[PDB]
Amino acid sequence: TSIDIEDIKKILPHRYPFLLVDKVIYMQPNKTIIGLKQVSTNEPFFNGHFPQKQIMPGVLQIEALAQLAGILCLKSDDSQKNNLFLFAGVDGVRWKKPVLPGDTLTMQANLISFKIAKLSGVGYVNGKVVINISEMTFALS
Amino acid sequence: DTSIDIEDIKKILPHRYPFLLVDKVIYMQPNKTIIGLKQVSTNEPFFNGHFPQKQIMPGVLQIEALAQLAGILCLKSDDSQKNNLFLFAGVDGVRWKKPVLPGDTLTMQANLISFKGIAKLSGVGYVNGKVVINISEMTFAL
Amino acid sequence: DTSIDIEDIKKILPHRYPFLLVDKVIYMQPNKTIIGLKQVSTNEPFFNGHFPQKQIMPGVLQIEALAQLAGILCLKSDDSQKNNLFLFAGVDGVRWKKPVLPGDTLTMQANLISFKSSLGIAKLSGVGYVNGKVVINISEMTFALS
Amino acid sequence: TSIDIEDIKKILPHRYPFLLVDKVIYMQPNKTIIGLKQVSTNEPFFNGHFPQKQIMPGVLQIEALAQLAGILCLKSDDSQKNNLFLFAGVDGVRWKKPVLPGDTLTMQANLISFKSSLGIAKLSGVGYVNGKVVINISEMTFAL
Amino acid sequence: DTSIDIEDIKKILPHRYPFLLVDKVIYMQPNKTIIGLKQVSTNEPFFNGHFPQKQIMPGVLQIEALAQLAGILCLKSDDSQKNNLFLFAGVDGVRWKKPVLPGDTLTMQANLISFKIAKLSGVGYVNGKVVINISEMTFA
Amino acid sequence: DTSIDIEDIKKILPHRYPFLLVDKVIYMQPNKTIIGLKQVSTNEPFFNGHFPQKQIMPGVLQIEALAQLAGILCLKSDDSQKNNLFLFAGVDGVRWKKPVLPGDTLTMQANLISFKSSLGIAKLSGVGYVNGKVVINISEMTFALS
Ligand SMILES: Clc1cccc(COc2ccc(Cl)c3cccnc23)c1
């Protein structure tokens, strides 16, 4: 079920400057989620990273995916009345290609286990893989 | 032709954050037309104020994005006057047709009409192949 | 002669930092005209980008200022629809004459021309001044109640 | 003489979001300076002070007068080629009236003493909205 | 544990970002003394302005932080006056001794002198060292 | 001493506000280990969005923090290459044990494992502490010299 940006902030507690999901285009509960984060020069981190070369910081690509991952969790089982999810561990992260101003970062997250929730995440720009995440781990606290 | 990425955009335009609204230039023909894009993310400083309860890209910011793209065109068309500080002099016939929202790609084209400094240009911006804004005439001064 | 202060403007308008650009409303007549001001300070977030070597108020933000003021008038002329989300639908005949600089007071007047409850079509003209002298002219602003 | 913001930036090292003089309207070397700071809703401190009632922080009023005091010093004597001035002391500050968005804060600073090249300048300062005193300062002391 | 973490400070002070300058209250004695801290990081908004080539914490922001700390003590000392919007009315005998820099832990103590109309003293330390003295902060 | 203060950090790292997350280097030994710290203040811009109701230091930023300290060690161990623009190639074995909060001092250690300046390729391990106690652990941080 497709989601525009007002409804994301109803699920997630993240606000500016640390909401890194712009749209949710496809979601299947307990299974997968697809979404995007538009990379514009008009974002606050870009001045710091870097003055002479504007490149999306890798860690913020993790955060992006992790957030989209967390939307899936909250919409797969919100029985625990808590939207405050905390990153507990992350493993097998590979950055292949610089994400630059102008790109669309398309993102896919797959639920492995919900016991502590564990997920994987891929990031595409132009159908080409830019980030890989073997395993994001999350523990609503 | 060749794409002018952002680092090279900042070498042409004097605009900086939080008022640089052109992310990439995909095609430019000197003295004629220019196509650019602006990626609209929730991670932009203006969104918290427009509006807290419904994030919509201010319409005047779309004009500003288009007028900056038009400005790139002018400076590469004739830099004989190597002053990059161009000021908006007039704008005419602006119609916004659809809300530009976070998640969108604002695709933009500007068209040089006349040039002498005084230059005139038309602008159009699209999201998903659909017209979001039209500008008959942007007028500019050196 | 109602004097409206930033807290009460924040009750009318859904705009917030950094895109609220009316600081005060000095005169308002419902269904007719509104006069207000915006103080122009170096200490605004837009000025670092426009421009590094020469701070000048972006003309579009002068458009926005006058629009927001105009939209105040609209919501105090007719709030029967309790929606405060007005979008810009069209603008026509905009002339910038003088540069608006840090230190200036931007006195603004918007006049209501037509108000159609058909589509939510309100139409307004707008003039901005610094020191009694015209800095911006707008022949027609068109707005759409969402 | 009147001084624009562009020239203010030539004299003062202060940059956004800590430059609090928008215009110098009258200056006399070695004696007195007059200047203004336009107070808009569109400043980054206003969200923090305070969400529910927007009041210009008093310490920022002190800063604004201090920056204006600073300009006068640098134009009264720039034999010391150093624009980086440090507040060393402040005495006799009184806030009378809340400074609000939409106000013009007109400021005046009066040089009291200058030790040329110990770098110790002393000055007084007053701030006004609408002809009415909003801030008094008995003595700013600076480390040049 | 006689202290107050950030979430609890925000229930006391109306101040928010970018003008909340107390991170943690480590000791407090009602009607007497308050000890607090503020961590000084390059990643703070004011440091780009002051100064581009030499990051120094604005002295007035040292005054503001101490005053904020003093403000918590007042309110926890007597909240019968049901108002958390305190205004600075005056400040006296402020002396800056040393620059405060990114990386320092600004440790601050404010001492209540008189109430009802509140007057207090303030001292700031980096590494035991006195960075700022305030003889008298006046509140109403 | 072996202490680099913020000014010298900014000569080594290209990072600026709001993405410079090493405040001070307290001990460094070239080609081996580095100890630095990041001061956690409520007066940082990320805290407003993470989270409104509960200010917690984004875990990812704790990675960046460590990686930037890792980078300082690499650029001082070997600056053969006239390039300070290090990109994160991959990260591995990250655990977050305890929330980092406004008021904490994040004390950080990164250790060099392997370096081949032939390619411009380095690997590092990292641990973050608050009050002597572990808050973050990182098995492997991999970085490219681009
Ligand atoms: Cl006109 C003006 C100028 C500067 C600061 C202020 C008020 O500062 C405060 C507000 C709220 C609280 Cl609860 C405080 C507490 C302590 C110190 N200052 C406080 C008023």
PDB file of C-alpha atoms in Angstrom, chain B:
ATOM      1  CA  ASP B   1      25.388  17.459 -24.330  1.00  0.00           C
ATOM      2  CA  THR B   2      27.718  16.735 -21.469  1.00  0.00           C
ATOM      3  CA  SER B   3      26.143  16.950 -18.028  1.00  0.00           C
ATOM      4  CA  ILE B   4      27.223  19.793 -15.771  1.00  0.00           C
ATOM      5  CA  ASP B   5      27.155  18.268 -12.269  1.00  0.00           C
ATOM      6  CA  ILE B   6      26.712  20.333  -9.079  1.00  0.00           C
ATOM      7  CA  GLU B   7      30.412  21.222  -8.385  1.00  0.00           C
ATOM      8  CA  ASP B   8      30.472  22.878 -11.835  1.00  0.00           C
ATOM      9  CA  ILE B   9      27.056  24.535 -11.250  1.00  0.00           C
ATOM     10  CA  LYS B  10      28.558  26.301  -8.190  1.00  0.00           C
ATOM     11  CA  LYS B  11      31.382  27.591 -10.407  1.00  0.00           C
ATOM     12  CA  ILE B  12      28.816  29.270 -12.648  1.00  0.00           C
ATOM     13  CA  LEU B  13      26.209  30.458 -10.124  1.00  0.00           C
ATOM     14  CA  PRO B  14      27.023  32.519  -6.985  1.00  0.00           C
ATOM     15  CA  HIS B  15      24.082  30.900  -5.128  1.00  0.00           C
ATOM     16  CA  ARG B  16      24.804  28.788  -2.071  1.00  0.00           C
ATOM     17  CA  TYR B  17      22.837  26.873   0.588  1.00  0.00           C
ATOM     18  CA  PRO B  18      20.068  27.276   1.478  1.00  0.00           C
ATOM     19  CA  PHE B  19      19.262  29.063  -1.798  1.00  0.00           C
ATOM     20  CA  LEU B  20      20.782  26.887  -4.547  1.00  0.00           C
ATOM     21  CA  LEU B  21      17.812  25.157  -6.167  1.00  0.00           C
ATOM     22  CA  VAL B  22      19.383  23.393  -9.176  1.00  0.00           C
ATOM     23  CA  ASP B  23      20.719  19.911  -8.512  1.00  0.00           C
ATOM     24  CA  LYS B  24      21.880  18.903 -12.014  1.00  0.00           C
ATOM     25  CA  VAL B  25      21.919  20.140 -15.615  1.00  0.00           C
ATOM     26  CA  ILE B  26      21.182  17.304 -18.043  1.00  0.00           C
ATOM     27  CA  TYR B  27      21.099  19.212 -21.328  1.00  0.00           C
ATOM     28  CA  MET B  28      22.143  22.718 -22.327  1.00  0.00           C
ATOM     29  CA  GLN B  29      22.334  24.342 -25.731  1.00  0.00           C
ATOM     30  CA  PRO B  30      24.034  27.772 -25.613  1.00  0.00           C
ATOM     31  CA  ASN B  31      21.787  30.702 -26.646  1.00  0.00           C
ATOM     32  CA  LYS B  32      18.689  28.417 -26.823  1.00  0.00           C
ATOM     33  CA  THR B  33      17.446  25.999 -24.166  1.00  0.00           C
ATOM     34  CA  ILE B  34      18.509  24.410 -20.889  1.00  0.00           C
ATOM     35  CA  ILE B  35      17.174  21.420 -18.968  1.00  0.00           C
ATOM     36  CA  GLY B  36      17.799  20.830 -15.285  1.00  0.00           C
ATOM     37  CA  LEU B  37      16.369  19.008 -12.333  1.00  0.00           C
ATOM     38  CA  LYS B  38      15.838  19.681  -8.623  1.00  0.00           C
ATOM     39  CA  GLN B  39      15.325  16.724  -6.299  1.00  0.00           C
ATOM     40  CA  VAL B  40      12.628  17.568  -3.732  1.00  0.00           C
ATOM     41  CA  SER B  41      13.411  15.939  -0.389  1.00  0.00           C
ATOM     42  CA  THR B  42      11.851  16.298   3.068  1.00  0.00           C
ATOM     43  CA  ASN B  43      15.447  17.037   4.120  1.00  0.00           C
ATOM     44  CA  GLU B  44      15.293  20.694   2.972  1.00  0.00           C
ATOM     45  CA  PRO B  45      15.230  23.597   5.485  1.00  0.00           C
ATOM     46  CA  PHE B  46      12.163  25.301   4.009  1.00  0.00           C
ATOM     47  CA  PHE B  47       9.794  22.350   4.489  1.00  0.00           C
ATOM     48  CA  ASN B  48       9.330  22.752   8.282  1.00  0.00           C
ATOM     49  CA  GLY B  49       7.781  26.171   7.563  1.00  0.00           C
ATOM     50  CA  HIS B  50       5.737  25.315   4.481  1.00  0.00           C
ATOM     51  CA  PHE B  51       3.846  23.738   6.044  1.00  0.00           C
ATOM     52  CA  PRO B  52       4.169  22.053   9.460  1.00  0.00           C
ATOM     53  CA  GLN B  53       1.020  19.996   8.743  1.00  0.00           C
ATOM     54  CA  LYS B  54       1.376  19.572   4.969  1.00  0.00           C
ATOM     55  CA  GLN B  55       4.782  19.813   3.244  1.00  0.00           C
ATOM     56  CA  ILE B  56       4.343  21.602  -0.128  1.00  0.00           C
ATOM     57  CA  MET B  57       7.138  23.166  -2.169  1.00  0.00           C
ATOM     58  CA  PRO B  58       6.601  26.914  -2.008  1.00  0.00           C
ATOM     59  CA  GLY B  59       5.606  28.077  -5.475  1.00  0.00           C
ATOM     60  CA  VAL B  60       8.054  31.017  -5.397  1.00  0.00           C
ATOM     61  CA  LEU B  61      10.841  28.498  -4.845  1.00  0.00           C
ATOM     62  CA  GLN B  62       9.941  26.803  -8.107  1.00  0.00           C
ATOM     63  CA  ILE B  63      10.240  30.161  -9.886  1.00  0.00           C
ATOM     64  CA  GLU B  64      13.613  30.574  -8.174  1.00  0.00           C
ATOM     65  CA  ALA B  65      14.761  27.105  -9.309  1.00  0.00           C
ATOM     66  CA  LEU B  66      13.660  27.863 -12.874  1.00  0.00           C
ATOM     67  CA  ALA B  67      15.220  31.343 -12.858  1.00  0.00           C
ATOM     68  CA  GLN B  68      18.532  29.904 -11.659  1.00  0.00           C
ATOM     69  CA  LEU B  69      18.484  27.393 -14.516  1.00  0.00           C
ATOM     70  CA  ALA B  70      17.715  30.210 -16.947  1.00  0.00           C
ATOM     71  CA  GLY B  71      20.673  32.063 -15.337  1.00  0.00           C
ATOM     72  CA  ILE B  72      23.053  29.142 -15.918  1.00  0.00           C
ATOM     73  CA  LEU B  73      22.022  29.329 -19.595  1.00  0.00           C
ATOM     74  CA  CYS B  74      22.736  33.085 -19.875  1.00  0.00           C
ATOM     75  CA  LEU B  75      26.176  32.920 -18.283  1.00  0.00           C
ATOM     76  CA  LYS B  76      27.402  30.060 -20.518  1.00  0.00           C
ATOM     77  CA  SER B  77      25.783  31.626 -23.595  1.00  0.00           C
ATOM     78  CA  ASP B  78      27.730  34.858 -23.171  1.00  0.00           C
ATOM     79  CA  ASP B  79      30.217  35.247 -20.340  1.00  0.00           C
ATOM     80  CA  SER B  80      31.946  38.151 -22.109  1.00  0.00           C
ATOM     81  CA  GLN B  81      30.387  39.976 -19.157  1.00  0.00           C
ATOM     82  CA  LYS B  82      31.877  37.588 -16.561  1.00  0.00           C
ATOM     83  CA  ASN B  83      29.713  38.989 -13.762  1.00  0.00           C
ATOM     84  CA  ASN B  84      27.736  36.039 -12.334  1.00  0.00           C
ATOM     85  CA  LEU B  85      25.473  38.106 -10.053  1.00  0.00           C
ATOM     86  CA  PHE B  86      22.237  38.239 -12.083  1.00  0.00           C
ATOM     87  CA  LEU B  87      19.188  39.870 -10.495  1.00  0.00           C
ATOM     88  CA  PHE B  88      15.547  39.046 -11.299  1.00  0.00           C
ATOM     89  CA  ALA B  89      14.058  42.103 -13.002  1.00  0.00           C
ATOM     90  CA  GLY B  90      10.576  40.926 -13.922  1.00  0.00           C
ATOM     91  CA  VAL B  91       8.439  37.806 -14.031  1.00  0.00           C
ATOM     92  CA  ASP B  92       5.279  37.285 -16.113  1.00  0.00           C
ATOM     93  CA  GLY B  93       2.545  34.682 -16.567  1.00  0.00           C
ATOM     94  CA  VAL B  94       3.231  32.216 -13.779  1.00  0.00           C
ATOM     95  CA  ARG B  95       0.764  29.346 -13.336  1.00  0.00           C
ATOM     96  CA  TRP B  96       1.269  26.558 -10.800  1.00  0.00           C
ATOM     97  CA  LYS B  97      -0.792  23.510 -11.769  1.00  0.00           C
ATOM     98  CA  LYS B  98       0.090  20.810  -9.239  1.00  0.00           C
ATOM     99  CA  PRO B  99       1.559  20.650  -5.710  1.00  0.00           C
ATOM    100  CA  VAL B 100       5.265  19.799  -5.755  1.00  0.00           C
ATOM    101  CA  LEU B 101       5.747  17.414  -2.836  1.00  0.00           C
ATOM    102  CA  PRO B 102       8.649  15.606  -1.085  1.00  0.00           C
ATOM    103  CA  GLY B 103       9.626  12.508  -3.144  1.00  0.00           C
ATOM    104  CA  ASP B 104       9.304  14.380  -6.488  1.00  0.00           C
ATOM    105  CA  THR B 105      11.827  15.171  -9.203  1.00  0.00           C
ATOM    106  CA  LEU B 106      11.290  18.628 -10.545  1.00  0.00           C
ATOM    107  CA  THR B 107      12.387  18.441 -14.193  1.00  0.00           C
ATOM    108  CA  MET B 108      12.900  21.937 -15.574  1.00  0.00           C
ATOM    109  CA  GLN B 109      13.427  23.639 -18.924  1.00  0.00           C
ATOM    110  CA  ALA B 110      14.184  27.291 -19.702  1.00  0.00           C
ATOM    111  CA  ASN B 111      14.178  28.873 -23.144  1.00  0.00           C
ATOM    112  CA  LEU B 112      16.127  31.927 -24.226  1.00  0.00           C
ATOM    113  CA  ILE B 113      13.916  34.427 -26.077  1.00  0.00           C
ATOM    114  CA  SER B 114      16.166  37.476 -26.427  1.00  0.00           C
ATOM    115  CA  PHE B 115      19.436  38.672 -24.956  1.00  0.00           C
ATOM    116  CA  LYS B 116      21.379  41.904 -24.519  1.00  0.00           C
ATOM    117  CA  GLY B 117      22.338  43.194 -19.505  1.00  0.00           C
ATOM    118  CA  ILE B 118      18.732  42.328 -20.312  1.00  0.00           C
ATOM    119  CA  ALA B 119      17.750  38.729 -21.138  1.00  0.00           C
ATOM    120  CA  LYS B 120      14.263  37.172 -21.372  1.00  0.00           C
ATOM    121  CA  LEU B 121      13.418  33.492 -20.905  1.00  0.00           C
ATOM    122  CA  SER B 122      10.453  31.158 -20.618  1.00  0.00           C
ATOM    123  CA  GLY B 123      10.225  28.357 -18.085  1.00  0.00           C
ATOM    124  CA  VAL B 124       8.377  25.075 -17.535  1.00  0.00           C
ATOM    125  CA  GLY B 125       8.760  22.461 -14.755  1.00  0.00           C
ATOM    126  CA  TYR B 126       7.441  18.878 -14.698  1.00  0.00           C
ATOM    127  CA  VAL B 127       6.887  16.089 -12.185  1.00  0.00           C
ATOM    128  CA  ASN B 128       6.295  12.669 -13.769  1.00  0.00           C
ATOM    129  CA  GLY B 129       5.904  14.102 -17.268  1.00  0.00           C
ATOM    130  CA  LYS B 130       3.125  16.370 -16.027  1.00  0.00           C
ATOM    131  CA  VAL B 131       3.281  20.190 -16.079  1.00  0.00           C
ATOM    132  CA  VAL B 132       3.507  21.616 -12.549  1.00  0.00           C
ATOM    133  CA  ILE B 133       4.503  25.231 -13.349  1.00  0.00           C
ATOM    134  CA  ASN B 134       4.574  27.556 -16.332  1.00  0.00           C
ATOM    135  CA  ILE B 135       6.348  30.875 -16.691  1.00  0.00           C
ATOM    136  CA  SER B 136       5.850  32.915 -19.829  1.00  0.00           C
ATOM    137  CA  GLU B 137       8.624  35.419 -19.152  1.00  0.00           C
ATOM    138  CA  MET B 138      11.406  35.778 -16.615  1.00  0.00           C
ATOM    139  CA  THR B 139      13.326  39.068 -17.087  1.00  0.00           C
ATOM    140  CA  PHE B 140      16.948  39.482 -15.836  1.00  0.00           C
ATOM    141  CA  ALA B 141      19.577  42.189 -15.193  1.00  0.00           C
ATOM    142  CA  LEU B 142      23.393  41.791 -15.105  1.00  0.00           C
TER     143      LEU B 142
END
